[PDB]
């Protein structure tokens, strides 16, 4: 036990002694109770002495720096255990030690910085609600001594290392030091005058000042009001900064040509300004000079210009907070009340004419000039929107990208928000800036892909912020200019960029087009032009922009425009093939979806039928051709070409049906019969393929194709069933034939052949139809239930899709077709329960959630919707089975996520035995489990006893009385969910393994706060136009 270490440090010879030190530290961490008091005191004594020996000479210090480092680490390690108990003296000892030699003082500072790092790291995540303040107040007296130390040290020092370490320590202790002690003392003057100017001390000095500025003064008068001191600090520091940084100096170009220290300094400056402004802004506003506010914000802009993601993130956050605070002032105006006259700003959207408010005494005007710059920079720092699918790769060529980092996306949202607020503050100057940049992009030869892109992205992203009129004018100019750019600039790249931008913009402005149809027509034809170009990305974006525009402005296409002789949709239908010539099938599907929206817009039923007919003319004709061909021989069906084609037709129909909805029935009835026959055919082809080539045949491409076909058909059927309005007809006409086609086949098919999409379909049709599938339910269970289960038993993990969809199917059945469920054979029920229980016994959170949900719905339905004898027998077996399993799962370290439902489930279980209401108490289920277990009659008593027996297994450290109280708590709190689950939660927390398990148990409490948060965010955002995307409405 380290006697050999003492001898080691001296007698040896150096890696080995360090290793021994690490063993020592690891042991002290490992053990603390075992040591005898004399030996603990002794080890502290000797470690202190050995520290002292190297100290007295700076040469020895620099020579032994690593050894000193490990020594200090061991010291802080022991310190965490020993110091909180009883060691005030150490601090004073350190005070006397710094007043001994320079070196000793340095080491002391390093030590303080280390201990502070170890404790403060633990306490800075705390948010400093109540705890950090109390700790501060308790150790205030010692901290004062520490201040006298740091201050006088700062005054006496001449050695760089001393000053540096001192400042580091001061930084670490800033929050903890009494604020009054800080402010009354001329510490600030000392920091500014000597060290801030010195390059070496400058960064750390600035970080300290930043921390002081950030310091919350939650009492304006509680101790004293420190606004006056802070103002002096900010002013003088700002002046010094002005001296350090040239006005003419351009940060953007300079910054890349800089080392780590300088960049870190700029970061420190941004953090400083942002922190101070965030916490104490009105102070500078009220100042008469006004120069410092504007100068600081100008610095903020210059720094914001710099191309660095971190710095820019900081600046951006502050800018957002500022512009929100400024805007909400306008929002809180009495002028809102005069919205009726047309005056002021509506609660909705629409930026007000800036001129109307210039006569007001408002904060915004103070920043007027600054704002005019900010917008520009915000335009310059705009990023690629969600909708845009193409980007120039580093190498050169334009390419298509599916998704981007979340970090980029949230950045986009924040920047958009800022741009919107800026636009609201002054729509005119905004319009002027964007118009200028636009004119330069078109003719001014300020042209670059980057500039054009960011400008256009900014333009599109301000939709609904501007009132319809200014928006109208501006958009007219923009559209003309971009069309000009579209035809003038050539080459795949240039045209791709221009087209992309114009498509995004027109995508973002539906309302303008609604009142100005000619532009709508023009941009549509231009979309087709873009569609025919070589690059796939422009095709995709053309189709997507088209579907957006169709979605928002569907009604106009059906209507007759005064300009045109016929409805535009009619024009589209005839030329549809020519348009879709170059398209990939997905693009085609999207197209047909948009057209589907347009068809959905039609109020006239017969015309709707006609339009739908002519719309599906091509897929229907192709379908008929294929039907004839397959009718002659179904061998053609098992050909890659045919499979892919049929799949395409099906997907097209899916898109169309998805957009049109309830009025798709004329189309489907036509196709419906032949689909069933195709389904039966393909299935039969599979049965032959397997018989010839064994069960392995399913792996081969042909069978995979057949299954693909069947799946597509089913997906179409599902879609239409979702959209249906006439449930009775669907039940009568579609369902029996559908089940006739799918079920017996599904049963007879081999496991390889069986497809989960059938189960998905059953789930969907039962979900929509509800109590009309009840008659058909026995047929489904007969053909599905027994065979599917055996696919789970033999193979534990296999057929996961089948697993999830089987369970979800059962959930749908019980949830929607309960009265039908009571007819099941008793044997099947146990399997149902087993599946339900396993569903919880899995690592996947979602399927588990669904499982516990299903069990809950089950027992609830048994209680509330069933006769008492049926229910009480049901519980006679399943109450015990379920309760047991639920407890097993809850008690496990894994499956913590399920707690949210688990909590409720138990609550219900107890609810059925002893409720908290009733003049004469109402028992949901009277009789209990079979006699062989216990002949002892009584529910509550047996429940308590049994729960105790199970609980003793979990943890034996519990008193029988603890169990007793817990059970009673469970019984009385069955009425209130929150209280019950909380008590259970804390009770679980008490356990050691659960203490180390952390807290997943707070799931519900997390959910509620996010619900309210999002509701608030959406509420304030709705109050401001532009913040809501049209599609999000």
TrEMBL record:
Coiled-coil zones: 992-1021
SUPFAM superfamilies assigned: ARM repeat (SSF48371)
Gene3D superfamilies: Leucine-rich Repeat Variant
Annotated InterPro entries: ARM-like, ARM-type_fold, CRM1_repeat, Exp1_repeat_2, Exportin-1/Importin-b-like, XPO1/5, XPO1_C_dom, XPO1_repeat_3
Listed GO CC annotations: cytoplasm; nucleus
Top-rank taxon: Eukaryota
One annotated GO biological process: protein export from nucleus
Segments forming domain Exportin-1 C-terminal: 667-996
GO molecular-function term, one example from the UniProt record: nuclear export signal receptor activity
Location(s), subcellular: Nucleus
Assigned keywords, A-Z: Coiled coil, Nucleus, Protein transport, Transport, tRNA processing
One Pfam assignment: CRM1_repeat_2
Biological role: tRNA nucleus export receptor which facilitates tRNA translocation across the nuclear pore complex. Involved in pre-tRNA splicing, probably by affecting the interaction of pre-tRNA with splicing endonuclease.
Similarity-based family: Belongs to the exportin family.
Stated name of the protein: Exportin-1 C-terminal domain-containing protein
């Amino acid at each position: 036990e380290d006697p050999d270490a003492w001898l080691m440090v001296d007698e040896i010879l150096e890696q080995t002694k360090f290793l021994a030190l690490q063993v020592l530290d690891n042991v002290i961490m490992t053990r603390w109770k075992v040591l005898p008091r004399e030996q603990c005191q002794g080890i502290r004594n000797f470690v202190v002495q050995y520290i002292l020996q190297c100290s007295s000479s700076e040469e020895s210090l620099r020579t032994h720096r690593t050894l000193l480092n490990k020594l200090n680490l061991v010291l802080v390690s022991v310190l965490k255990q020993e110091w909180p108990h009883n060691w005030p003296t150490f601090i004073n000892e350190i005070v006397s030690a710094c007043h001994s030699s320079l070196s000793v003082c340095e080491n002391n500072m390093i030590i303080l910085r280390l201990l502070s790092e170890e404790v403060f790291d633990y306490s800075a995540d705390q948010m400093t609600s109540t705890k950090t303040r109390n700790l501060k107040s308790t150790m205030c007296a010692e901290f004062s001594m520490i201040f006298q130390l740091c201050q006088e040290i700062l005054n006496s020092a001449t050695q760089p290392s001393l000053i540096k370490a001192t400042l580091e320590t001061l930084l670490r202790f800033c929050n903890w030091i009494p604020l009054g002690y800080i402010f009354e003392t001329p510490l600030i003057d000392t920091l500014r005058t000597r060290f801030l100017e010195v390059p070496e001390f400058r960064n750390v000095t600035l970080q300290c000042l930043t921390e002081i500025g950030g310091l919350q003064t939650g009492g304006p008068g509680q101790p004293h009001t420190y606004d006056e001191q802070l103002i002096k600090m900010f002013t003088e520091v700002l002046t010094t900064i002005s001296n350090i940084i040239p006005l003419q100096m351009d940060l953007k170009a300079t910054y890349p040509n800089s080392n780590s220290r300088d960049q870190e300094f700029i970061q420190n400056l941004a953090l400083f300004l942002t922190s101070f402004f965030t916490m104490h802004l009105p102070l500078i506003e009220n100042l008469p000079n006004r120069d410092f506010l504007t100068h600081g914000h100008f610095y903020l802009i210059r720094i914001s210009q710099i191309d660095d993601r971190e710095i820019f993130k900081i600046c951006l956050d502050y800018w957002l907070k500022l512009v929100q605070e400024l805007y909400e002032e306008m929002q809180s105006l009495p002028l809102n009340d005069m919205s009726s006259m047309g005056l002021g700003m509506m609660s909705g959207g629409g930026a007000p004419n800036p001129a109307l408010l210039e006569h007001y005494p408002l904060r915004k005007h103070k920043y007027k000039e600054v704002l005019s710059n900010l917008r520009v920079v915000m335009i310059e720092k705009m990023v690629r929107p969600e909708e845009v699918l193409i980007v120039e790769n580093d190498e050169g060529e334009i390419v298509r990208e599916f998704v981007k980092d979340t970090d980029s996306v949230q950045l986009y949202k924040t920047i958009r928000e800022c741009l919107v607020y800026l636009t609201h503050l002054d729509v005119v100057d905004m319009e002027q800036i964007m118009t200028e940049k636009l004119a330069r992009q078109v003719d001014g030869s300020e042209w670059s892909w980057h500039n054009c892109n960011v400008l256009c992205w900014a333009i599109g992203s301000i939709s609904m912020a501007m009132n319809e009129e200014t928006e109208k004018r501006f958009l007219v100019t923009v559209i003309k200019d971009l069309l000009g750019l579209t035809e003038m600039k050539r080459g795949k790249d240039n045209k791709a960029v221009v087209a992309s931008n114009i498509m995004y913009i027109v995508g973002q402005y539906p309302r303008f087009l609604k009142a100005h149809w000619k532009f709508l027509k023009t941009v549509v034809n231009k979309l087709f032009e873009f569609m025919h170009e070589s690059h796939e990305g422009v095709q995709d974006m053309a189709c997507d922009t088209f579907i957006k525009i169709a979605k928002q402005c569907r009604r106009h296409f059906v209507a007759l425009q005064p300009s045109e002789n016929e409805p535009f949709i009619e024009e589209i239908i005839r030329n549809i093939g020519k348009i879709t010539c170059d398209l990939t099938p997905q693009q085609v599907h999207t197209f047909y979806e948009a057209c589907g929206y347009m068809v959905s817009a039609q109020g006239n039923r017969n015309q709707q039928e006609r339009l739908l007919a002519e719309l599906m003319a091509i897929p229907n004709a192709a379908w008929d051709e294929i039907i004839k061909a397959a009718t002659m021989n179904p061998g053609i069906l098992h050909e890659p070409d045919t499979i892919k084609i049929i799949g395409n037709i099906m997907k097209t129909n899916v898109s169309a049906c998805s957009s049109i909805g309830p009025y798709f029935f004329p189309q489907i009835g036509r196709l419906y019969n032949d689909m069933l026959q195709m389904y039966a055919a393909t299935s039969q082809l599979i049965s032959e393929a397997v018989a010839r080539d064994g069960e392995i045949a399913t792996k081969m491409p042909k069978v995979r194709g057949l299954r693909t076909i069947k799946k597509e058909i089913l997906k179409l059927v599902e879609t239409f069933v979702e959209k249906a309005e006439d449930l009775q007809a669907v039940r009568s006409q579609m369902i029996p034939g559908l089940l006739d086609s799918v079920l017996v086949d599904y049963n007879r098919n081999v496991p390889g052949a069986r497809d989960a999409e059938v189960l998905k379909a059953m789930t969907v049709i039962i979900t929509r139809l509800q109590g009309l599938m009840e008659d058909q339910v026995p047929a489904i269970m007969e053909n599905v239930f027994e065979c599917t289960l055996d696919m789970i038993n033999k193979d534990f993990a296999e057929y996961p899709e089948h697993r999830v969809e089987f369970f979800n199917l059962l959930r749908a059945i019980n949830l929607y077709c309960f009265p039908a469920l009571l007819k099941l054979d008793n044997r099947q029920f146990k399997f149902v329960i087993d599946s339900c229980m396993w569903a919880s016994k899995h690592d996947n959170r979602d399927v588990e959630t669904a499982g516990l949900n299903m069990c809950l719905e089950l027992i609830n339905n048994i209680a509330e919707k069933t006769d008492v004898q049926t229910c009480n027998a049901f519980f006679n077996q399943f109450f015990i089975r379920i309760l047991q399993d639920v407890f097993f799962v809850l008690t496990d370290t894994d499956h913590k996520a399920g707690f949210k439902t688990q909590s409720m489930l138990l609550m219900r279980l107890f609810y059925f035995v002893h409720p908290a209401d009733g003049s004469a108490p109402k028992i949901q289920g009277p009789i209990y489990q079979p006699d062989q277990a216990q002949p002892g009659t009584g529910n509550r008593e047996f429940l308590a006893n049994f729960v105790g027996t199970l609980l003793q297994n979990a943890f034996a450290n519990l008193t029988p009385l603890q169990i007793t109280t817990f059970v009673k708590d469970c019984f009385e709190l069955n009425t209130q969910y929150d209280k019950f689950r909380v008590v259970l939660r804390d009770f679980l927390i008490s356990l050691r393994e659960f203490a180390g398990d952390n807290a997943e148990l707070y799931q519900v409490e997390k959910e509620q706060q996010e619900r309210e948060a999002r509701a608030a965010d959406l509420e304030r955002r709705s109050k401001v136009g532009g913040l809501l995307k049209p599609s999000e409405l």
